[PDB]
């Protein structure tokens, strides 16, 4: 059920003072304490280890809803509308979307990126950390980004 996801995310941006859209170490802790639950700087940290999928350090929507539920994060479109786009970016083809094709294509894309950007991209993405993104990093990167943007 989606009204399960609703009220999950009304809990999140209720307990982000911020309204980012990511749940920091204190307001992870201060959820977790509203559900009575005593988290230990070492539980609350061992969780963030656990969720934070793009290593960014905050806990967005996503990683919150894969590390409870992990299919109800479901992928909007197909493997194969996403191996049309990932050969879209990849344009030497071979399996791997490198720094170069990235920033290639989103320039295409009228998206000046800077180096940094580039590199939060990558860093974001990338979790073999070979530097590129394969085909399963796309995937995983596409649909935790698309789930967030549906119920942000
Ligand atoms: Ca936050
Ligand atoms: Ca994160
Ligand atoms: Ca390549
Ligand atoms: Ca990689």
């Known amino acids: 059920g989606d009204e399960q996801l609703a009220e999950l995310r009304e809990i999140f941006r209720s307990f982000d003072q911020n309204k980012?859209?990511?749940l920091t170490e204190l307001e992870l802790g201060?959820?977790?304490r509203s559900l009575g639950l005593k988290p230990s700087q070492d539980q609350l940290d061992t969780l963030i280890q656990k969720a934070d999928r793009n290593n960014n350090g905050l806990v967005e929507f996503?990683?919150?809803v894969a590390l409870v539920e992990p299919d109800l994060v479901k992928c909007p479109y197909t493997d194969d509308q996403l191996k049309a786009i990932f050969r879209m970016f990849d344009r030497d083809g071979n399996g791997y979307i490198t720094a170069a094709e990235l920033a290639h294509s989103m320039a295409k894309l009228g998206h000046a990126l800077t180096a940094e950007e580039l590199t939060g991209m990558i860093k974001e993405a990338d979790r073999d950390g070979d530097g590129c993104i394969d085909f399963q990093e796309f995937v995983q990167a596409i649909t935790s980004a698309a789930f967030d943007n549906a119920w942000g």
């Open 20 to 22: 980012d859209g990511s």
């Open 30 to 32: 201060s959820l977790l």
């Open 62 to 64: 996503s990683e919150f």
